[PDB]
Design a protein around this ligand. Structure first.
Ligand SMILES: [Ca+2]
Length: 223
């Protein structure tokens, strides 16, 4: 997150770190056995880290559970990142409590202007690189479709939206994707891609989760 603020420990109880000997992607717990992330974060050897704040120190509240199955949406396209969504089943269920909680899936899509919170342990710098120890937060609004498509003409499908700061300075970045965009207590987006960060007139592009609720529930009911 470029231009964000320290969240505060365990204030975003649904946020997970995907780990393979270091942090590389975010995710969201949507029930005790399933995590929603980005299809682009897929790799084998994923360990899901729950209840985290300082990703480099064991502080209490953490649950480390291995991924059992990662189910990349079958129409994921890595060149366009269309349908950038992935389901991870936990090898074992998490203990839900105040610090480890699931986030609701939406029943309707959200409108332009809705404010949302985006979080992650990704890069903090637009130029260069600096990875935080603790979880960063950013309040950002969903932008209109027209503003999104004129910023990335030809690259925005119906499964994407642009949340942020056309001014620059505030945006999500590398290592944040796979993580949550929560608006009014509903997981509305997954951090997916953008042109640099916190780049002026290049807002962040996000997977539109409301388009995927039936698929998540059917895929979860059969696995
Ligand atoms: Ca830790």
């Amino acid at each position: 997150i470029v231009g964000g603020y320290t969240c505060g420990a365990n204030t975003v109880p649904y946020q997970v770190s995907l780990n393979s000997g270091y942090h590389f992607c975010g995710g969201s717990l949507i029930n005790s056995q399933w995590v929603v992330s980005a299809a682009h974060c897929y790799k084998s050897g994923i360990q899901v880290r729950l209840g985290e704040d300082n990703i480099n120190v064991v502080e209490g509240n953490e649950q480390f559970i291995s991924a059992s199955k990662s189910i990349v949406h079958p129409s994921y396209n890595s060149n366009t990142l269309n349908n950038d969504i992935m389901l991870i089943k936990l090898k074992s269920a998490a203990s839900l409590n105040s610090r480890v909680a699931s986030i609701s899936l939406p029943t309707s899509c959200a409108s332009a202007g809705t404010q949302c919170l985006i979080s992650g342990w990704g890069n903090t710098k637009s130029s260069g690189t600096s990875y935080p120890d603790v979880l960063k937060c950013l309040k950002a609004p969903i932008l209109s479709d027209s503003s999104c498509k004129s910023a990335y003409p030809g690259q925005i499908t119906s499964n994407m939206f642009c949340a942020g700061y056309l001014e620059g300075g505030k945006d999500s970045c590398q290592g944040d994707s796979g993580g949550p965009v929560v608006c009014s207590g509903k997981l509305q987006g997954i951090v997916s891609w953008g042109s640099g960060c916190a780049q002026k007139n290049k807002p962040g592009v996000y997977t539109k989760v409301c388009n995927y609720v039936s698929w998540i529930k059917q895929t979860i009911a059969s696995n």
